[PDB]
Amino acid sequence: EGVIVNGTQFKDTSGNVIHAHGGGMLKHGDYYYWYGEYRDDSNLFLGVSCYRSKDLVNWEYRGEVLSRNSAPELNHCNIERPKVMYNASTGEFVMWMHWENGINYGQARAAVAYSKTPDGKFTYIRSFRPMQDTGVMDHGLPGYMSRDCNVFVDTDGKGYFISAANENMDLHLYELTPDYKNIASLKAKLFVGQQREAPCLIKRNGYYYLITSGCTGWNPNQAKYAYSKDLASGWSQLYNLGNSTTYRSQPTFIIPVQGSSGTSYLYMGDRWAGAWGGKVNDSQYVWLPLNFISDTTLELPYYDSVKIDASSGIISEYIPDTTRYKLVNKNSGKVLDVLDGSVDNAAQIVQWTDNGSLSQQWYLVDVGGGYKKIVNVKSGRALDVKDESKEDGGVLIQYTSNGGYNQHWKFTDIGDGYYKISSRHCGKLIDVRKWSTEDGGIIQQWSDAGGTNQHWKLVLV
Numbered sequence: 041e042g043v044i045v046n047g048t049q050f051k052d053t054s055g056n057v058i059h060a061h062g063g064g065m066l067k068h069g070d071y072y073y074w075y076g077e078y079r080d081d082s083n084l085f086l087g088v089s090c091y092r093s094k095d096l097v098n099w100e101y102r103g104e105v106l107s108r109n110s111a112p113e114l115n116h117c118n119i120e121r122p123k124v125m126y127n128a129s130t131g132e133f134v135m136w137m138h139w140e141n142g143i144n145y146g147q148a149r150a151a152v153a154y155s156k157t158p159d160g161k162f163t164y165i166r167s168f169r170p171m172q173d174t175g176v177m178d179h180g181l182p183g184y185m186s187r188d189c190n191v192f193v194d195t196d197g198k199g200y201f202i203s204a205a206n207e208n209m210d211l212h213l214y215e216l217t218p219d220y221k222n223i224a225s226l227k228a229k230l231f232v233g234q235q236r237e238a239p240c241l242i243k244r245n246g247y248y249y250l251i252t253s254g255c256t257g258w259n260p261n262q263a264k265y266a267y268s269k270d271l272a273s274g275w276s277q278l279y280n281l282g283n284s285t286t287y288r289s290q291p292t293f294i295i296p297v298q299g300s301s302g303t304s305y306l307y308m309g310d311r312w313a314g315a316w317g318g319k320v321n322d323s324q325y326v327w328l329p330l331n332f333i334s335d336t337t338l339e340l341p342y343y344d345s346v347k348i349d350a351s352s353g354i355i356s357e358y359i360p361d362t363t364r365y366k367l368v369n370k371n372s373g374k375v376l377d378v379l380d381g382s383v384d385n386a387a388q389i390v391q392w393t394d395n396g397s398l399s400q401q402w403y404l405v406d407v408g409g410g411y412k413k414i415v416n417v418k419s420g421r422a423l424d425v426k427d428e429s430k431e432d433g434g435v436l437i438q439y440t441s442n443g444g445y446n447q448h449w450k451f452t453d454i455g456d457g458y459y460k461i462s463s464r465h466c467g468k469l470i471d472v473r474k475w476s477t478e479d480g481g482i483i484q485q486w487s488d489a490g491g492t493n494q495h496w497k498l499v500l501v
């Protein structure tokens with residue numbers, strides 16, 4: 041029973057609210073370690089909590105691996121986005137983070153710690169602004185500014201540290217020394233003047249991916265991503281990811297969940313309570329599966345409930361009602377199907393002869409109000425009005441779940457088991473183009489005309 045409810049505050053095995061905001065995760069041995077920070081009462085750094093788990097749903101409290109007592113500096117400061125990486129050679133765990141005075145944000149510096157054990161008390165080292173000795177000046181202070189940060193371990197066992205420099209306008213990817221505890225050089229200056237923060241660096245199949253989240257304080261914004269074959273250069277443009285608010289959250293870390301069947305990259309972010317005028321500790325979490333259509337095309341769907349099976353390594357949507365359905369048209373007598381039963385995103389939806397195929401089976405997930413989400417079985421995408429069109433003849437396709445109103449449908453009973461399925465965006469019904477009665481009939485969107493080609497019957501399976 042590994043189901044997670046997004047937009048809420050998870051609870052550990054003890055029954056207490058988990059407090060690991062802006063944190064990350066590490067997979068070592070047989071355990072997944074969730075690190076993160078949380079303010080106390082003065083909105084200052086209290087400690088960096090640590091949770092262990094095997095199922096990724098039931099978390100176990102392990103205490104503060106880093107405390108405000110670990111160092112004199114930590115007695116009064118701001119610490120955000122603490123990440124931990126493993127060093128194969130040494131056998132210890134290096135921890136990076138973002139450090140501030142607690143009075144202001146002039147001290148854009150990073151901080152380092154480490155420990156022989158994962159859930160053990162880390163020993164604070166030093167806070168500093170990278171590249172201090174080079175003598176380079178960044179806004180009046182020694183060393184490049186370093187705010188929003190994150191860590192990454194390449195296949196060749198080389199450590200990397202990413203952070204926002206030059207007033208969060210540029211992203212600096214620093215290459216770490218073999219011990220991961222120091223900066224060896226500035227690998228590359230990525231996305232200059234683009235002003236991206238909250239970076240997440242990962243790799244899949246010889247391709248590096250960089251997930252960002254613009255920069256709009258607490259208020260959620262349009263998240264984007266990019267790819268490249270090399271960390272040094274060859275980076276692509278910023279392609280939009282998720283919706284206009286990243287599903288009311290901000291990216292924090294992305295970890296590959298490997299299992300028996302395969303690997304499913306997990307996305308996790310924060311729904312900062314600051315959005316509605318709340319303390320950091322009241323912030324909620326949002327976990328979603330990061331799907332890869334292709335080596336150059338990424339997908340970040342929004343599932344109100346996510347099911348995870350770490351053992352098999354599968355992250356998919358949780359369907360409250362497993363009841364299958366097929367939508368038969370009154371006029372043609374054919375059922376709703378996906379063109380060529382394809383599972384390619386944005387696939388055209390067409391009518392087809394009832395052949396008991398998977399492509400002709402659909403779930404009905406309630407999404408509030410009198411509207412519902414029509415999801416396919418073979419693929420798992422939702423019925424979507426292409427490009428949120430509000431005009432007649434608007435093609436219907438199956439697209440990644442994005443909580444858009446162009447994916448919510450209301451059923452209006454007209455009798456004899458037939459309904460008029462209207463969209464929540466404009467209110468136009470699901471229409472069979474040109475009253476087609478043959479296979480491959482294009483399913484579209486059209487205003488209510490009282491036609492029989494607009495009436496659909498709900499049939500169990």
Ligand SMILES: CC(C)S[C@@H]1O[C@H](CO)[C@H](O)[C@H](O)[C@H]1O
Nearest residue numbers: 424425426427428439442444446
């Ligand atoms: C492309 C954006 C302006 S709208 C975007 O288009 C997609 C299909 O291409 C889906 O229909 C999404 O639901 C829709 O929001």
